[PDB]
């Protein structure tokens, strides 16, 4: 059975803190920002070339 509000482990103030301060949204923004400091994948065609195999048609 789904649990009701009165059987919740977290107090209402902690939940309100998560609600008003957008905790998981901030985690998502941080994950996006981490990518900004990683190496990009781009190659500079036609000066560089993607992989080609002997079977290519």
């Amino acid at each position: 059975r789904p649990a009701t509000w009165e059987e919740s482990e977290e107090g209402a103030l902690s939940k309100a803190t998560k609600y008003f301060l957008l905790a998981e949204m901030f985690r998502g923004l941080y994950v996006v920002l981490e990518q900004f400091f990683r190496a990009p994948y781009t190659i500079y065609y036609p000066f560089e070339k993607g992989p080609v195999s002997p079977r290519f048609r």
């Binding site: 065609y45 036609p46 002997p54």
Partner: protein
């Protein structure tokens, strides 16, 4: 990209480890004709003009009169 000669084109795409100048003699093609490299001439007076390599399947009579 069409100015890259064949062989080098394969090497640049990580097709082969060893570059064409480093490839031993046994793994080169023998040619009985002169090798010429030509890039894409599209949009240029040198663009390929296609045509039928056959003459027509039915040949007409060459008309000749005879005297009665």
């Amino acid at each position: 990209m069409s100015q890259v000669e064949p062989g080098w084109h394969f090497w640049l795409g990580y097709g082969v480890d060893t570059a064409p100048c480093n490839t031993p003699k046994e793994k080169l093609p023998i040619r009985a004709y002169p090798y010429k490299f030509q890039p894409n001439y599209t949009g240029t007076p040198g663009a390929f003009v296609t045509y039928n390599t056959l003459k027509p399947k039915i040949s007409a009579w060459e008309p000749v009169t005879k005297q009665r």
